[PDB]
């Protein structure tokens, strides 16, 4: 029922009201990490950031934060049966599989920042509503095709 254009049109007007601007993050399996990387290089202090930070290293940081804070990520893997917390980290770190809510909350605590996800038909979600570092602003598309993320610049 052309839900792709319907979601894009609502997101377009949503950022117009929020004074935000969309990016063109390539919609492959690294969209979430690339959008977070772009938001880090845009809103974070460059003197306090790893300049050589790339996608697969953010893939390594999220997977290690889950491995050392496993109890904080167990509830995000049940409901059927439960996905093995360890096997989930080895497949997310070495492949190009789509990242989700687990990688957002993990990286939000890794960099001590809020990470906002803008969606159409939903209020803004803010992960780590409390990080002292500047908030990263992302946008999620459900119908633009599975989990595609993009970066949000100012104005």
Swiss-Prot record:
Entry GO MF terms: cysteine-type deubiquitinase activity
Position of the signal peptide: none
Gene Ontology CC: one annotated term: cytoplasm
Domain OTU: 20-155
Superkingdom as given in the UniProt entry: Eukaryota
More details: Present with 172 molecules/cell in log phase SD medium.
Protein name: OTU domain-containing protein 2
Species the sequence originates in: Saccharomyces cerevisiae (strain ATCC 204508 / S288c) (Baker's yeast)
Positions spanned in the full protein: 148 to 307 of 307
